[PDB]
Amino acid sequence: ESITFKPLRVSSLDQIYESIDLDELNENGIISIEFVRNRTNTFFRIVDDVTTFNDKSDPVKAEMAVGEANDFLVSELKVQLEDQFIGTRTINTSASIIKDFIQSYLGRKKRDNEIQDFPAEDVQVIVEGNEARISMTVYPIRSFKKISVSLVYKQQ
Amino acid sequence: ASEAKQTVHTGNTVLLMIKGKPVGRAQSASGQREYGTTGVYEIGSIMPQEHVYLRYEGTITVERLRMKKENFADLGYASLGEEILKKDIIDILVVDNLTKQVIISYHGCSANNYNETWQTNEIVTEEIEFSYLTASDKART
Amino acid sequence: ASEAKQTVHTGNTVLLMIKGKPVGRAQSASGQREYGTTGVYEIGSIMPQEHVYLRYEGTITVERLRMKKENFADLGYASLGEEILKKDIIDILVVDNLTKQVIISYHGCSANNYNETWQTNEIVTEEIEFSYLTASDKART
Amino acid sequence: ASEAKQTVHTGNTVLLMIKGKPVGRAQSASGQREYGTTGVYEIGSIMPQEHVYLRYEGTITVERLRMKKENFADLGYASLGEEILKKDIIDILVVDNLTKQVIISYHGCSANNYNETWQTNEIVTEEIEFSYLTASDKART
Amino acid sequence: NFADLGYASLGEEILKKDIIDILVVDNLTKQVIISYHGCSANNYNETWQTNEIVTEEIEFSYLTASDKART
Amino acid sequence: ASEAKQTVHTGNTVLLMIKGKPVGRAQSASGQREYGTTGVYEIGSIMPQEHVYLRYEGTITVERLRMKKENFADLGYASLGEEILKKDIIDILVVDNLTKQVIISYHGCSANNYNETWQTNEIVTEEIEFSYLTASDKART
Amino acid sequence: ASEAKQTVHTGNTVLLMIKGKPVGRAQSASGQREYGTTGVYEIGSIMPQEHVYLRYEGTITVERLRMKKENFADLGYASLGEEILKKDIIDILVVDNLTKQVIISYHGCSANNYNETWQTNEIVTEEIEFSYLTASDKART
Amino acid sequence: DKLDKFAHEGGYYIVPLSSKQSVHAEVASFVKERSDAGEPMRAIVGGGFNESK
Amino acid sequence: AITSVDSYLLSEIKPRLNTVLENCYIIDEVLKDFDYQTRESFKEAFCGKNAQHEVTVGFNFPKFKNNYEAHYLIQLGQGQETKNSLGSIQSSYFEATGDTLVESSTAIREDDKLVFTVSKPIGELIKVEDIEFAKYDNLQVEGNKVSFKYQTNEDYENYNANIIFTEKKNDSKGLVKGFTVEEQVTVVGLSFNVDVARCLDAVLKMILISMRDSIEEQQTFQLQNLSFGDIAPIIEDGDSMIFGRPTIIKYTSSLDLDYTITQDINKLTFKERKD
Amino acid sequence: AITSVDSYLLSEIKPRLNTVLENCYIIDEVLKDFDYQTRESFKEAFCGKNAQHEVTVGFNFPKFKNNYEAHYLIQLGQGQETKNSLGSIQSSYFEATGDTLVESSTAIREDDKLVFTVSKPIGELIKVEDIEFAKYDNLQVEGNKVSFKYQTNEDYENYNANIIFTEKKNDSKGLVKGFTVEEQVTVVGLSFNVDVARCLDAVLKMILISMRDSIEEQQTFQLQNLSFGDIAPIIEDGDSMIFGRPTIIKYTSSLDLDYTITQDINKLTFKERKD
């Protein structure tokens, strides 16, 4: 879950950025706070997740929430993998066995809703003496950003 | 000569592996899966108009000769009491002796019942039955 | 000499075919059908006045030796998890070795349960049981 | 048999949503309605001349297995104490799993009964009863 | 379904639904066995469950029932 | 499967406490609530415009196997004769066994019904019904 | 498992006595109580402010196999005709078999219902219902 | 030197309570080192009062 | 593929037996349980590269004199049919395939792909050692050589791999008709010294154990069973007796024949009828 | 570990038989059911330290004359394979291990620990007699010697313990491939006096009973079964007949071979991909 759009309790702000002012910051990789007013309520909201990195091409680079999801996924996987094969005394191991273990791990995450989808066949494993190379892909989660609405008034 | 187009699997071309460790003196294993197919019967037909999948139940059994060391109890894979509650899931792999490629793997295996037989005229044997979440035959060629 | 008026079918005169592919090293198959006949009993009679058909249930089983290639899992005919939901129906044909004419065909076959046995002293075997919509013996001479 | 081709909604095909989230570990759901139908009778004849609708009653039931997190009490969709007066109406949707299309929606759901059970070896069961203002089945076409 | 087909209604649209006639028929010859005239809805029930098939139930009250055209 | 990782409260994970003691040989516990919900109807339309809450009813049930010591009668949590008028309110807690965290609490519990049974070969069963003032689920977060 | 060490009253451990005699061929016994509990409600809030006790109802049930001698009718503990008006109150005790210690006592028992059955191959069953004035559990400590 | 003290501690999020640009560079370099080393981290930074866009 | 168990046994035994007798460490491992005297005598006589005495192996009824100091004697034995399939069908193949080959092959660089060369064309690729090619690598076989994408794998330009593959014979297709046969083959060691016979039998048992990892009997001769006879005097009419302990080896193999098919459909004639 | 049942039988029989025949009390216990005459005659002939007559044991077909007053004759017999495991896998080992040894070793004082010395290094410690080391004692093995905390155990500075342990051979790791074999071995006593043969058979039965507590057959040769033949004249062509009653002994042992593994993983290369 991203910090995007979530409210904040801050009493007040020095400057109240306009819609265009906010757009310039966010497009240039600046995270800001937005003000809104209800009938009798007021909120301060985090407009979006953006890092200093500017390019919109790759969500992992731009949105820290997406990159964070990848970060914890890989780090938790590798440390577990280190324990099973490197740490624990393993007598034998094959590339395919590693491939199955990886697929088992990813399937569990989907069952826990941590990841929405992924390619099963994209995984690659190579072993070379005392070293192994692992390559895989997972689709980042996409959040809901824009809604456009139009109204039509009519008689009767 | 050896034409691979007709080869079959046997007890001498298979390995049973847990956590990378090959379980020793393992004798047999059986796997079951039930999709719970059920038919749909209309009023104006005795025949089933169609079948539908409803429920996935699967179990795997393993028979072994109790080695003096590395038995299922000593390995920590099985359990004998409340220690079970702290036992996490495991994955049981059937891997090819020749290539070390995988033939079938069971994910999220959990233990169901435990049986051991002490007998006078025969070697000691123990049997375990697991219940698994899903099966997989990936990582092929 | 060979008088056809008395010939019978055997294992050497039959082929088991799926999607045109002859399944290899297939051992046995059994077919069951239940019409669910029930009688009607009046007050003034212990005898059943008549019988009526009510429900059609049918299953077919297949026993096979797991070849290293083209096993039921690799062929995509069977399934091991949620992949089953994307598997469509199939038709299983029993066809004559001599003439390649059909003897009996099962339409709209769907899988019911899956069994595989790993054993030390014997060749690996697997068993599948299907549920079918209708059977047919058409396309004869 | 296949996912798309089955003409009937199995329990698997259906998904239940509340307020932009799925409901985990759901087990059952029932919806009952009464249009308050009555018959018109007069002196001329016994037979009812017409039928009319008087009052609309709509209730939906849900059962769930109490998760250690994200329960109705934890999630705020249901309340125990006086906080209920601070709870607004809720809208429930029953959804097609394949495409997230809507099957039926309940508008203005408010709580009537809340039941909970604990037992030695069973799973904790959480039940709740909702009364709603209207039920609509639109956006399908 | 009845909701999709309009034979049954959920919301206020019921007031826009007219009477319905039901027939129970012999499959062989499409001869009539019994007919219900002036059917109008009383109760509508629906259930969902983990591994069962979705069951839809409905209750109709009618004005008259006739068994004619058989002879 | 493991103790910590199971997302669902099994009966084993739960513990029941009264007044700083656990309740031994507990077997069942149920809690039911009714908010006294009603619908608002007017002449303009049949459909209910709004729903409101009228009265709060809360009851909890408990069953227990009569121990030779520490029963409710022995422990004073329940009374048989006129001594009930000298018994104050009681608070019940349902607890997570692992960490002694609170899951739900019942405040102001007072007794309604008390039932007891004896039988030839069954275990003595003690049942009691409590009505309470409020139920709260706090201190979890 | 042992007689003394079992913390739970099995049916075997219990003995039932009336007027200095044991009741032979007893089969069942149940005791139910209602304190006539009610809730207090006011205009200020829906929640019940307090609970109070109104009326005390106490009933005990007993079943027995009609012996050829020493039945309730034979023993005078129960009556059929107008002789009931000549029958005084009775006190029942439920006793620990090991030491003849008292477990619970019913004071002022008077009869409400008396039921009897005969059947081809079953044992004759005699049932009786007693209403009492008070129930006390004292002399244990 | 202060930031190097936090290596091998698992704190994913780190925040320096300062506006100095050079300090921000130190954290960014440090976070870069840890991420490649196998300890991912994220840094959140913000400086001064009402600073110009 | 008709099976000649005796020739396979000879081909497996000769180089493997020579290699085992080449070095002393393996022999000492084998003869751990035997006494010092017989162990050391056998090692002195037969073991080592520079051994003066040598063992031999051959079939029965040789017209020439055969050395009886230490020899492995083979005879064919009985056979039986145990299992069959429907229509005697064993497998179906689209491309004619011969034996299964294992070849070492160092990686090579090609302008778009890393590749491995092989001796002969490929009918089917079973396994590449310690590799699980993904979609990105786009594994492709083009006759003699197998190939994968150059760019993302460029670290492995000289990977010392080895390959398990299958020969390609023809593009025709056919059916495999045959059955399974349960065969028994007898093997006996001969020596006028009984201790030499015992050690020879132990060595035979060890090489039979080692053979189970061989490709051919993994693919062709599964379900190996062993049975040993009693030490008996093979001959008494000489100046000194011949002592030998026969052993019976069992195997299961699939005798089969490839039945070609000339029927190939390439056009369809869907037309209606009128009346 | 290939098994030579005959050599094990000889090694177990010779010292044990000598010890049993050494003293009269054990022999009297053995021959309780026999009559006075034969019992006392056998005791006079063979029993006692200073016995003039002596029994012998050896294998069959000896080129030299063999004493036929009282002798134990062994011959190898048949064998069969009875059970197998998947892939012929019996066990997995991280450190090469030889035989299981039992050694007596008096406790010794070291500045921080009490220790026991042993003849050879330790691969694994099975048991220390009448000891169950706790966490406080912090049992540790460091090559030749095993050690435990000095302070709280200081009363036992000279504990006359004994140790059951296993030899250490190498630090390499591998797999154990093999099967189980059900073997039959024949043993017969020879004597021109039938009563001596009967008593000899009884002694043989007793020593077979006693052997079941031996370490080696407890670990290697389980499931011992016995079968006795009829008293028959072994030879009639001499001046007087040879009488003997053959006995058949059965055993179950695991013929196996250690397959080493050179693959050792020590590094990981987790990298992502881009497209």
Return the HEC string of chain B: CCCHHHCECCHHHEEEEECCEECCCEEEEEEEEECCCEEECCCCCCCCCEEECCCCEEEEEEEEECCCCCCCCCCCCCCCCHHHHHCCCEEEEEEECCCCCEEEEEEEEEEEEEEEECCCCCCCEEEEEEECCEEECCCCC
Are the CB atoms for I81 and I182 separated by under 8 Å? yes
Is I166 in Cβ contact with B4 (below 8 Å)? yes
Are the CB atoms for D117 and F32 separated by under 8 Å? no
Structure tokens at F13: 């994970």
**A91/B contact by beta carbon, under 8 A:** yes
Question: Alpha carbon of H30 to those of A50, A69, C102, E30: distances in Å?
Answer: 20, 21, 75, 84
DSSP D138: -
Phi and psi at residue D86, in whole multiples of 5°? Answer: -95, 5
Q: Which helix (H) or strand (E) holds A108?
A: helix A95-111
Beta-carbon neighbour count of residue A91 at 10 Å? 17
Question: Hey, is J115 helix, strand or coil?
Answer: strand
Structure tokens at I128: 């590449």
Report the residue of A61, A130, A138, A139 to disrupt the J interface, i.e. the one with the largest count of J CBs within 10 Å. Answer: A130
Dist CA E51 CA D27 (whole Å) = 9
Question: Hey, is C2 helix, strand or coil?
Answer: coil
Are the CB atoms for J169 and J99 separated by under 8 Å? no
Q: Which helix (H) or strand (E) holds A110?
A: helix A95-111
Phi and psi at residue F55, in whole multiples of 5°? Answer: -140, 145
**A90/J contact by beta carbon, under 8 A:** yes
Dist CA A99 CA B139 (whole Å) = 6
Structure tokens at G36: 């006539």
Dist CA I223 CA I204 (whole Å) = 18
DSSP A67: H
DSSP A141: P
Shortest alpha-carbon distance between residue C69 and chain B (Å): 8
Concatenate the DSSP letters of all residues of J91-107 into one string. EEESSEEEEEEEEE---
How far from the centroid of its chain's Cα atoms is residue C18's Cα?
Answer: 11
Q: Which of G40, G107, G94, G37 is nearest to F128 (CA)?
A: G37
How far the first Cα of chain J sits from its last, in Å, is 55
Is F5 in Cβ contact with B85 (below 8 Å)? no
Task: Specify the long-range contacts of residues G15-20, CB closer than 8 Å, at least 24 apart.
Answer: G15/G94, G15/G95, G15/G96, G15/G97, G15/G100, G16/F118, G16/G62, G16/G92, G16/G93, G16/G94, G16/G95, G17/G92, G17/G93, G17/G94, G17/G95, G18/G77, G18/G90, G18/G91, G18/G92, G18/G93, G19/G77, G19/G90, G19/G91
Amino acid at J190: L
Question: Alpha carbon of I13 to those of A139, I205, J230: distances in Å?
Answer: 55, 11, 43
Dist CA B63 CA A37 (whole Å) = 69
Taking CB atoms and an 8 Å cutoff, what residues of chain H touch A24?
53
Q: Note the resolution in Å, 1 decimal.
A: 4.3
The Cα angle at residue I57 between residues I52 and I62, in degrees rounded to 5: 115
Dist CA C104 CA C109 (whole Å) = 13
Structure tokens at B138: 């990936």
Dist CA J229 CA J244 (whole Å) = 9
Is C86 in Cβ contact with D1 (below 8 Å)? no
Segment 76-95 of chain B within 8 Å of chain F by CB: 85-89
Are the CB atoms for B126 and B71 separated by under 8 Å? yes
DSSP C43: T
Residue corresponding to tokens 């695991």: J254
Question: Hey, is J25 helix, strand or coil?
Answer: helix
Is I90 in Cβ contact with B1 (below 8 Å)? no
Question: Hey, is A106 helix, strand or coil?
Answer: helix
Are the CB atoms for D97 and D10 separated by under 8 Å? no
Phi and psi at residue B21, in whole multiples of 5°? Answer: -75, 125
Q: Which of J214, J251, J264, J262 is nearest to J6 (CA)?
A: J251
Q: Which of I131, I155, I154 is nearest to I146 (CA)?
A: I131
The Cα angle at residue H16 between residues H14 and H20, in degrees rounded to 5: 140
Q: Which of J88, C120, B13, C25 is nearest to I218 (CA)?
A: B13
Concatenate the DSSP letters of all residues of D15-71 into one string. EEEETTEE-TTEEEEEEEEE--EEE---SS-SS---EEE---EEEEEEEEE-BSSS-
Q: Please report which residue ranges of chain J form alpha helices under DSSP H.
A: 5-22, 24-30, 36-46, 194-211, 215-219
Three-class SS string for chain G?
CCCCCCCECECCCEEEEECCEECCCEEEEEEEEECCEEECCCCCCCCCCCEEECCCEEEEEEEEECCCCCCHHHHCCCCCCHHHHHCCCEEEEEEECCCCCEEEEEEEEEEEEEEEECCCCCCCEEEEEEECCEEECCCCC
Residue corresponding to tokens 């700083």: F20
Shortest alpha-carbon distance between residue E38 and chain D (Å): 9
Report the residue of D53, D61, D68 to disrupt the F interface, i.e. the one with the largest count of F CBs within 10 Å. Answer: D68
**D31/E contact by beta carbon, under 8 A:** yes
Amino acid at F130: F
Phi and psi at residue G129, in whole multiples of 5°? Answer: -120, 130
DSSP A139: P
The Cα angle at residue J164 between residues J161 and J169, in degrees rounded to 5: 130
Dist CA B106 CA A103 (whole Å) = 11
Is E44 in Cβ contact with D11 (below 8 Å)? no
The conformational region for residue A81 under phi > 0 = left, psi -120 to 50 = alpha, else beta, is alpha
Are the CB atoms for B26 and B75 separated by under 8 Å? no
Q: Is the dihedral of CA I196, I197, I202, I204 positive or negative?
A: positive
Are the CB atoms for G110 and G131 separated by under 8 Å? yes
Beta strands across the sheet bearing J108-109 = J108-109, J113-116, J145-149, J140-142
Question: Hey, is H4 helix, strand or coil?
Answer: helix
Segment 12-51 of chain I within 8 Å of chain J by CB: 29-35
Method: cryo-EM
Shortest alpha-carbon distance between residue I220 and chain B (Å): 6
Residue of B nearest to E27 (CA): B44
Cβ burial D93-117 (10 Å sphere, 16+ → b, else e): bbbeeeeeebbbbbbbbbbbbbebb
Dist CA I217 CA B2 (whole Å) = 8
B:F CB pairs within 8 Å: 13
Amino acid at G24: G
| Chain F and chain I touch, per 3+ beta carbon pairs within 8 A | no
Q: Are strands E32-49 and D125-131 parallel, antiparallel or unpaired?
A: unpaired
Question: Alpha carbon of I160 to those of A98, A130, C122, I163, J265: distances in Å?
Answer: 21, 14, 37, 10, 18
Q: Are strands A131-135 and J269-270 parallel, antiparallel or unpaired?
A: parallel
Are the CB atoms for B130 and A124 separated by under 8 Å? no
Chain B residue set in contact with I, beta carbons under 8 Å: 1-8, 10-13, 97-99, 101, 139, 141
Q: Are strands D26-34 and D57-65 parallel, antiparallel or unpaired?
A: antiparallel
Are the CB atoms for I167 and I98 separated by under 8 Å? yes
Are the CB atoms for D53 and D33 separated by under 8 Å? no
Residue corresponding to tokens 């059937």: B94
Neighboring chains of A (3 or more beta-carbon pairs < 8 A): B, H, I, J
How far the first Cα of chain E sits from its last, in Å, is 34
Question: Hey, is C4 helix, strand or coil?
Answer: helix
Q: CB-CB: which of H12, H40, H53 is closest to A25?
A: H53
Q: Which of I217, I121, I214, I105 is nearest to I166 (CA)?
A: I121
Three-class SS string for chain I?
CCCCHHHHHHHHHHHHHHHHHHCHHHHHHHCCCCCHHHHHHHHHHHCCCCCCCCCEEEECCCCCCCCCCCEEEEECCCEEEEECCHHHEEEEECCEEEEEEEEECCCEECCCEEEECCCCCCCEEEEECCEECCCCCCCEEECCEEEEECHHHHHHCCCCCEEEEEEEEECCEEEEEEEEEEEEEEEEEEECCHHHHHHHHHHHHHHHHHHCCCHHHHHCCEEEEEEECCCEEEECCCCCCEEECCEEEEEEEEEEEEEEECCCCCCCCCCCCCC
Neighboring chains of G (3 or more beta-carbon pairs < 8 A): F
User: Dihedral angle at the C-alpha atoms of J191, J192, J197, J200, nearest 10 degrees?
Assistant: -40
Q: Which helix (H) or strand (E) holds A23?
A: helix A19-27
How far from the centroid of its chain's Cα atoms is residue I218's Cα?
Answer: 7
Are the CB atoms for F80 and F115 separated by under 8 Å? no
**Radius of gyration for the alpha carbons in chain C, expressed in angstroms and rounded:** 19
Are the CB atoms for A128 and I159 separated by under 8 Å? yes
Q: Which helix (H) or strand (E) holds A69?
A: helix A64-81
Q: In the beta sheet, which residues pair with residue G107? A: G134
Structure tokens at I200: 């020879």
Taking CB atoms and an 8 Å cutoff, what residues of chain F touch D85?
53
